[PDB]
Ligand binder design. Structure first.
Ligand SMILES: [Zn+2]
Length: 258
C-alpha cells in the first residue's frame, strides 16, 4: 500500500516509489557541530510574522498542519542564506513515542522529543506547486522541542487537537500567532536538502535553529493521542512520524554563529 512510518511502509521502503529517497541532497541530516563552519557571508535572518493569517488545522494522516493565507506577503522569511522572499504556508511537527526520540534532524547524534517545521515557498515561483519544481523553491525553518516547562504559545494548538483526532479531520484555526513558537535566539545551521516525507523533493533550503524550545510533558502527550487512521478505522496512535538522518554526501553545513 501507500507510504507512512510503519515496518511495512516506512522510510526504508520509500525509495521503491520515490527513487529520489536515495538522492544527493536528502533530509534530514545529522548536524555535526564540529564539522559545521561559520559563514560570515550569511545575511541577518528576518522572520517577519506580524501579519500572519492562520486559517485551519488539519490531521493529514502523517502529522497535523496549521495552514496560513499565503496569497500576499503576510508572514515571510528572508535573509540568512535566502535570496528573495519566502511566504509561510504551513507549520507541522514530527514527534516520538518516547521523550528521547522524535526529531528528524539530530545534533551530534542527539535526538530531541519533537521538531517543528515552518514551511515557506519562494514567491518568485508564483505558487507552492511551482516552487517544488525548483532547487531553491522552499525554505523550512526547523525548531527542536525538548521536554521541560510548558510553551505558552503552543497551548492553543494542543487545545484544538481533540477536534482533529483522525485522518481527514480539520477545524477552524484563525488568529494564531506563530511568533509564540520561536526560541529567543535565531542562531542557526543551514544546508541544502529535501522534503523529509514523500515525495522527498530536493527543493529545500533548511534553516535549523540552535536553541530548542521547551514544551511540557502534558503538551507532548497530547500530540501522541492523535491517530494516523481515519474515523471508524482501527486505532493507530500517531507517534514516531520522523525520518531518520540521511547521508550528508557532498554538502557542508554552514553556521550563522561561532
Ligand atoms: Zn516536516
Amino acid at each position: 500500500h501507500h507510504w507512512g512510518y510503519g515496518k511495512h511502509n516506512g522510510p526504508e521502503h520509500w525509495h521503491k516509489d520515490f527513487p529520489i529517497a536515495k538522492g544527493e541532497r536528502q533530509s534530514p541530516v545529522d548536524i555535526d557541530t564540529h564539522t559545521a563552519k561559520y559563514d560570515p557571508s550569511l545575511k541577518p535572518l528576518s522572520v517577519s510574522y506580524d501579519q500572519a493569517t492562520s486559517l485551519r488545522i488539519l490531521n493529514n494522516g502523517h502529522a497535523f498542519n496549521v495552514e496560513f493565507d499565503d496569497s500576499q506577503d503576510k508572514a515571510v522569511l528572508k535573509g540568512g542564506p535566502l535570496d528573495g522572499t519566502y511566504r509561510l504556508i504551513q507549520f507541522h511537527f514530527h514527534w516520538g513515542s518516547l521523550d528521547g526520540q522524535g526529531s528528524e534532524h539530530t545534533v551530534d547524534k542527539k535526538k530531541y522529543a519533537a521538531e517543528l517545521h515552518l514551511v515557506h515557498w519562494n514567491t518568485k515561483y508564483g505558487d507552492f506547486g511551482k516552487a517544488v519544481q525548483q532547487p531553491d523553491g522552499l525554505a523550512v525553518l526547523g525548531i527542536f522541542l525538548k521536554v521541560g516547562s510548558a510553551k505558552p504559545g503552543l497551548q492553543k494548538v494542543v487545545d484544538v487537537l481533540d477536534s482533529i483526532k483522525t485522518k481527514g479531520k480539520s477545524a477552524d484555526f484563525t488568529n494564531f500567532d506563530p511568533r509564540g513558537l520561536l526560541p529567543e535566539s535565531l542562531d542557526y545551521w543551514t544546508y541544502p536538502g529535501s522534503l523529509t516525507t514523500p515525495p522527498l523533493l530536493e527543493c529545500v533550503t533548511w534553516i535549523v535553529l540552535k536553541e530548542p524550545i521547551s514544551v511540557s510533558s502534558e503538551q507532548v502527550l497530547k500530540f501522541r493521542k492523535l491517530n494516523f487512521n481515519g474515523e471508524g478505522e482501527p486505532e493507530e496512535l500517531m507517534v514516531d512520524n520522523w525520518r531518520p538522518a540521511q547521508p550528508l554526501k557532498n554538502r557542508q553545513i554552514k553556521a550563522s554563529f561561532k
